[PDB]
Write a protein that binds this ligand. Structure first.
Ligand code: NAG
Lengths: 48, 48
């Protein structure tokens, strides 16, 4: 595709274009994932 | 299954009489949908 757009040459990114008007199942959601590792170690972090 | 006669058609239909076709019980080859010409628009929504 020599770095130019065309058939079978698609740019692998897409946009959302959120507007306050879409339905309840289409608005953006904010997601955070917490990962632990419960093993044997100096145990740097834990609670009160 | 035939996509030739729906694309290589001499006479087409008006916008208010848009032509209908149903296709079932066949094997669809969507690769030979490439040489319709140099430059055409190919956009699909829902699937890659
Ligand atoms: C019929 O349509 C196909 C669609 O790709 C095209 O390749 C083919 O050349 C057409 N037939 C003729 C005789 O041009």
């Amino acid at each position: 595709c020599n770095g130019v757009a065309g058939f079978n040459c698609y740019f692998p990114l897409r946009s959302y274009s959120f507007r306050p008007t879409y339905g309840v199942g289409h608005q953006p959601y904010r997601v955070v994932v917490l990962s632990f590792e419960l093993l044997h170690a100096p145990a740097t972090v834990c609670g009160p | 299954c035939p996509f030739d006669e729906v694309f290589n058609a001499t006479r087409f239909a008006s916008v208010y009489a848009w032509n209908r076709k149903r296709i079932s019980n066949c094997v669809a080859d969507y690769s030979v949908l490439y040489n319709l010409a140099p430059f055409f628009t190919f956009k699909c929504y829902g699937v890659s």
